[PDB]
Ligand binder design. Structure first.
Ligand code: 89I
Length: 329
């Protein structure tokens, strides 16, 4: 093996995933479309506490960036604490559970804990054939870099790292801290990776997303996200195989590393753009998966891919583990 700890740093919104099995007489209370993912409003406050009661649940350390780092450590059977992760949580039992589920993943998590807000949480409300998801960010959105990421002891773990990845959802929380990490990857010429996460980031956080873009070694994104990203910046093309070209020719601050743009397409090829020219890799099929996680499998692609890049392997092999990873899920 001989891979080393804290070799891959990650950072993002730690969400505590709470799945179970409900019905509808539990959903109509809070009125929720059987298969839809939205954000929690002040009329959903209880829905959390009332999902740990009347329903048998599992507790997984969730959130995109955190999902990707745990899958990267899974494919990283050894050593342990090979991947690190910073985020904000609350000082309540939910955060207690999160701290636990992550160590129980050999992930080296180091959280910014606080009281103001509860630990965030995502709610898996499955009726078997649906996915009503309720997300409440809370604590994940209170991260303070000056009192956590800026501290010597944690910042030294960002130093032990030779690869950084942050899902773009985190730009909605702290671009200043996304930046300190990206910038640093430049100054010490290490790899810094990023996710477009959702089309809304490209449409509504472009200023923050363009500030880090020059400091972005690799870029992860999907079909649609790719699509909207081009729409704004003015690429004109609608051809993904082309967008990957126009984007990756974007002003890259560090010039010592030319960039790689991996645009996934759900389960259907993968478009990589490098300094040379654009190729395309077809996916591993697992046909007629009615259960197909689909949404949230791109997080798994990213972990598997990351697991192979922390060892500087052929991009073709990083993309191989991306499929091994997405999915066991
Ligand atoms: C679809 N929902 C459930 C959804 C999607 C994705 C996430 C998500 C995940 N998976 N992992 C980590 N962070 C976030 C996060 C986050 C997040 C979501 C939305 C948002 N805004 C949307 C409205 O405009 C203001 C910015 N800002 C931040 C959570 C919830």
């Amino acid at each position: 093996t001989s891979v080393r700890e804290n070799i891959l740093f990650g950072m993002g919104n730690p969400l505590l995933d709470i799945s179970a099995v409900v019905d509808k007489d539990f959903l109509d209370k809070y009125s929720l479309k059987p298969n839809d993912q939205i954000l929690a409003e002040d009329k959903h406050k209880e829905l959390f506490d009332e999902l740990v009661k009347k329903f048998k649940v599992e507790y997984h350390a969730g959130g995109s960036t955190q999902n990707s780092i745990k899958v990267a450590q899974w494919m990283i059977q050894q050593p342990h604490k090979a991947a690190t992760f910073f985020g904000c949580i609350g000082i309540d039992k939910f955060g207690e559970i999160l701290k636990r589920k992550a160590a129980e993943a050999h992930v080296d998590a180091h959280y910014y804990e606080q009281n103001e807000q509860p630990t965030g949480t995502c709610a898996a409300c499955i009726t078997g054939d649906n996915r009503s998801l309720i997300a409440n960010l809370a604590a994940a959105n209170c991260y303070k870099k000056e009192k956590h990421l800026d501290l010597e002891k944690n910042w030294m773990l960002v130093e032990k790292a030779r690869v950084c990845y942050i899902a773009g959802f985190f730009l909605t929380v702290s671009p200043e801290s996304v930046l300190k990490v990206a910038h640093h990857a430049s100054e010490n010429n290490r790899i810094f990776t990023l996710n477009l996460s959702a089309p809304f980031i490209s449409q509504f956080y472009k200023e923050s997303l363009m500030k880090v873009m020059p400091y972005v070694d690799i870029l992860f994104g999907n079909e649609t996200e790719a699509a909207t990203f081009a729409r704004e910046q003015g690429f004109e093309t609608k051809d993904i195989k082309e967008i990957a070209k126009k984007t990756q020719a974007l002003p890259k601050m560090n010039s010592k590393r030319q960039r790689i743009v991996i645009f996934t397409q759900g389960r259907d090829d993968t478009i990589m753009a490098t300094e040379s020219e654009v190729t395309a890799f077809a996916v591993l099929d697992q046909d007629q998966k009615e259960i197909i996680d689909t949404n949230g499998a791109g997080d798994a692609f990213v972990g598997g891919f990351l697991s192979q890049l922390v060892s500087d392997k052929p991009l073709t092999e990083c993309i191989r583990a991306g499929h091994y990873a997405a999915s066991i899920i």
